[PDB]
A and B are shown apart, each in its own frame.
Chain A
Amino acid sequence: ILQESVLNKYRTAGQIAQTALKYVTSLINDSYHSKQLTVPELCLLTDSFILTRLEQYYNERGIAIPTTIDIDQISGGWCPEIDDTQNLLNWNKGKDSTFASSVTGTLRPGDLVKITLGVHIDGYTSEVSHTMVIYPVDETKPILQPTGPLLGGKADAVAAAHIAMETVVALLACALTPEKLPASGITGQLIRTIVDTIARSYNCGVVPGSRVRRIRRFLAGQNEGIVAEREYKGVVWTESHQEADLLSAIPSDDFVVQSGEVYLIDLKMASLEHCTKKGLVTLETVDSYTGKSHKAGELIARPGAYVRDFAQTHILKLKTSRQLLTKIDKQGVYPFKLSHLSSNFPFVHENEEELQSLKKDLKSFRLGMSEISNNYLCVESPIQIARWVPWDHILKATNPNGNLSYDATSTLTLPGHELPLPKLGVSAIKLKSLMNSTKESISLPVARECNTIVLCPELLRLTGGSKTCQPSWIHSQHELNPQDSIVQGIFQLATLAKDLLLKETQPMK
């Protein structure tokens, strides 16, 4: 229940995330836009910062989400270590120019950087993310605001992200008042309707992983793909909903939002300026195996985050593995890196010798994690790229057994027994086969926006704000079709929010 103890913990967990977001957005402008840090160097510095901040205030407390920096195709999972930088090169050495940013660590111009992170205190957690964008510099200008706005489909994506974010914020604010809503009381039906029509206006589809949901203590949705739950009220937009919208558990009907509750928003929009046609938007995993295929568009990598399934137990033969398991289970149920578990990781002072100390510890931790993973104690949080499939291949396909195809050597089970589209009787395995079975291997760029809110009378928005996620000014088109019900409602909502009360937590200096 929303006690003072609960909500001030939420606040002090949130604004740490806010100031760390400011730190990263600081550093990236320092590095690229200003007169050069790589992705994995940003990540552990951000986590060091967050823990150094956490120490001052406050027993279970730490990083829910390790800071993830997706670039231009990846829906989620990219957050590598310093161990893996040469490995990424000598794996992707023969591939082509795409994914050069994520491979090398140096970011390019026009590169759509989706940052995300989160922090938790006693199970009360706050996630946040922001799609920012790189654009080259002005040199003749004195102040050098960097030159050019964005124009294309990525601009579409950013616009849809921000607009969907503000609209759902306002909707969940009107959840307090059964009034101050255009009748054009609140339901996942309405939420999915307004966000889908925004996506359709901007020609940017919703990604399967996106959601809006309730939160409770220790139960946020940090994983959302591995661990299960019976009591989960919230909305998702996956391939089943895509096919249903083309036609015409997570129940959406018996769901009306109430006072005194904490919610997570997480929206992912994949742009369509090419593609030519109607088609599906699904996800494909990234493995470390160069040898499964010959094509150059594929990315080869190793995920850094893990999560451990405390239900299972197995004595290890290996001292290093058992010590690392001690270090793990003394942490919590949230995902983690190997760098988080170490002796010198927060970097009270920072030099090269401490990074070297961390690297040696990492060399031991990978050996421990080998045995901890060969037994099914810990699993990887997968790296997922958005990939497009036209309906032509799917409808012309041949699936000799539908609703019965497992994938049988997928290790997690829950991404195995999925059945994304029950109609047409195709499963994830045959969908992967069809996605690969075509020279229309079109991968989409994606934009991401994540916030945490709580309903008391005001909407207390524990993340976001204008300091945080002010958008990179851009130049998009398809800017919001008027002459419909829902668009009138959305504009009335945006005007009426200026009076509804939205409190917003500021970052820490």
Chain B
Amino acid sequence: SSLTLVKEALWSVIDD
């Protein structure tokens, strides 16, 4: 589920 975590972090960075 690594893609899940990296996409979560990437959403976090792009939303702010």
A-side interface residues toward B, CB under 8 Å? 246-247, 277-278, 391-392, 395, 423-425
Contacts and interface: CB of A to CB of B under 8 A. Distances in A.
- Per DSSP, chain B at the interface is helix
Contacts of B9: 247
A184 to B, nearest CB: 26
Contact of B6 (A277, A278, A392, A424): A424
Given A247-B9, A392-B14, A395-B7, 14 more contacts: A246-B13, A246-B14, A247-B6, A247-B10, A247-B13, A277-B14, A278-B13, A278-B14, A391-B10, A391-B14, A395-B10, A395-B11, A423-B6, A424-B6
A286 to B, nearest CB: 30
A247 B14 CA distance: 10
A-B pairs, top 10 by smallest CB distance, nearest first, are A278-B14, A391-B14, A246-B13, A423-B6, A395-B7, A395-B10, A246-B10, A247-B9, A395-B11, A425-B3
Contacts of A425: 3
A246 B10 CA distance: 7
Contact of B7 (A277, A278, A424): A424
Contacts of A246: 10, 13-14
Contacts of A424: 3, 6-7, 10
A392 B14 CA distance: 9
A424 B7 CA distance: 8
Interface of B: 3, 6-7, 9-11, 13-14
A391 B12 CA distance: 12
A425 B14 CA distance: 19
Nearest to A395: B7
Contacts of B10: 246-247, 391, 395, 424
Contacts of B6: 247, 423-424
Contacts of A395: 7, 10-11, 14
Contacts of A392: 14
A424 B5 CA distance: 11
Nearest to B11: A395
A360 B11 CA distance: 58
A221 B6 CA distance: 34
A247 B12 CA distance: 10
Nearest to B6: A423
Contacts of A423: 6
23 contacts: A246-B10, A246-B13, A246-B14, A247-B6, A247-B9, A247-B10, A247-B13, A277-B14, A278-B13, A278-B14, A391-B10, A391-B14, A392-B14, A395-B7, A395-B10, A395-B11, A395-B14, A423-B6, A424-B3, A424-B6, A424-B7, A424-B10, A425-B3
Nearest to A390: B14
Nearest to A391: B14
A245 to B, nearest CB: 10
Q: Report which residue of B10, B11, B13 has the largest number of chain A beta carbons within 10 angstroms of its beta carbon.
A: B10
Nearest to A279: B14
B10 to A, nearest CB: 6
Nearest to A423: B6
A103 to B, nearest CB: 36
Contacts of A277: 14
A278 B16 CA distance: 10
A395 B11 CA distance: 8
A424 to B, nearest CB: 7
A278 B13 CA distance: 9
A246 B12 CA distance: 10
Nearest to B2: A423
Nearest to A392: B14
A54 B12 CA distance: 57
A375 B11 CA distance: 47
A423 B11 CA distance: 14
A423 B13 CA distance: 15
Contacts of B14: 246, 277-278, 391-392, 395
Contacts of A391: 10, 14
A423 B9 CA distance: 12
A277 to B, nearest CB: 8
Nearest to B7: A395
A395 B7 CA distance: 7
Nearest to A394: B10
B15 to A, nearest CB: 9
B12 to A, nearest CB: 10
